[PDB]
Design a protein around this ligand. Structure first.
Ligand code: HEM
Length: 338
């Protein structure tokens, strides 16, 4: 891999130790600009205000609390995989799974599920229409009603929340929920398609995958990282990487996929090996390390198990399947088997 280069108004950072240095130094490399370049809610906040925001939901994302959702995710995954044969695995299984799970965790009522899913599609970007304005207005309306009833989910927690000498705004509550929906959907959908791609490419991996689902999910994260780069870091003060001065104000783009293929940290980076020792950076690292990582881990793990037990043979049909076009992420636009 390359030392940091500057072009198109940003530094590009590729090496694993440099990606990590940047992400671990939140006070040197900030998460929001000096102004306007557009990330919502606490993802774009710096360390102090950010912790206040993240703590509101942090306890409910511990692998401990998340695990109470295991039977629900199994039930859901099974319902959708039952009868998927011959269909688009992305739109009929991989998109639908994370959106069901997240509505359960949020506390979206049963009777609001159809509209939540339409709104969710618009908002993560899976849909674009005239209907947007209408559907957003309809969903936000329901949202306000839910905030004032109660459940055990996040909506209810955001209702009873403040942090440090100040109540949460209603725009903050919506954006908070929006950040959960947007950061957990496409990424989980992309991972599911990327695990299917590993299987397609390494057909005798299957037995080992079954014996260590976690391990297989970890190596996919490393090897076909759903998120390829994070474009939004800005130097809060001058500092040096590989003897280059990164000046205050400079945008710093950090490449996770590329860092996850660094031969300095991974022996034989271009091979798929379950049970590697070093941590991958697919979920980032530091104070912004993925809030949904335990949930994502548990969803992928059940998805793998279910996909592996449903099909005998897994060949991707490349005359109908296509990779997404966006360079920032990695996944299938559509995926058809066999
Ligand atoms: C396989 C799935 C995922 C991958 C590869 C992924 C990747 C990431 C990365 C790289 C970051 C850090 C961005 C930064 O440092 O600026 C992040 C943050 C975040 N993710 Fe995930 N993510 C995934 C799934 C999920 C899920 C299921 C959720 C649940 C709603 C979720 C919610 C969040 C939130 C709220 C943040 C920001 C945390 C903070 O800024 O403190 N993600 N994710």
């Amino acid at each position: 891999l390359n030392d940091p280069v500057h072009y198109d108004g940003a530094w590009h950072v590729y090496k694993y130790s440099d990606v990590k240095h940047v992400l671990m130094n939140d006070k040197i490399f900030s998460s929001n600009p000096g102004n306007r370049y557009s990330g919502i809610s606490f993802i774009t906040m710096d360390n102090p205000e950010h912790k206040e925001f993240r703590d509101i939901s942090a306890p409910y994302f511990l692998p401990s609390k998340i695990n109470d959702y295991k039977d629900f995710i199994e039930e859901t995954s099974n319902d959708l995989i039952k009868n998927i044969d011959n269909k688009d695995i992305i739109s009929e299984y991989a998109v639908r799974l994370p959106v069901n799970i997240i509505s359960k965790i949020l506390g979206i009522p049963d009777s609001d599920m159809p509209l939540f899913k339409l709104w969710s599609d618009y908002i993560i970007g899976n849909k674009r229409d005239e209907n947007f304005n209408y559907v957003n207005n309809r969903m936000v309306s329901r949202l306000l009603e839910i905030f004032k009833s109660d459940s055990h989910g996040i909506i209810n927690v955001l209702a009873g929340s403040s942090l440090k000498n100040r109540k949460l705004t209603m725009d903050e509550k919506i954006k908070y929920i929006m950040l959960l929906i947007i950061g957990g959907n496409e990424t989980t959908t992309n991972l599911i398609g990327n695990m299917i791609r590993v299987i397609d490419e390494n057909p005798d991996i299957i037995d080992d995958a079954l014996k260590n689902r976690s391990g297989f999910v970890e190596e996919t994260l490393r090897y076909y990282s759903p998120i390829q780069f994070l474009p939004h870091r800005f130097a809060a003060e001058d500092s040096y990487i590989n003897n280059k001065k990164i000046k205050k104000g400079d945008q710093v783009i950090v490449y996770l996929g590329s860092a996850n293929r660094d031969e300095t940290f991974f022996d034989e980076p271009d091979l798929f090996k379950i049970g590697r020792r070093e941590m991958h950076l697919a979920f980032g690292i530091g104070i912004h390390m993925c809030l949904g990582a335990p949930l994502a881990r548990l969803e992928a793990s059940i998805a793998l198990n279910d996909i592996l037990n449903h099909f005998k043979r897994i060949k991707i049909d490349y005359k109908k399947s296509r990779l997404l076009d966006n360079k920032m992420v990695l996944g299938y636009d559509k995926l058809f088997l066999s």
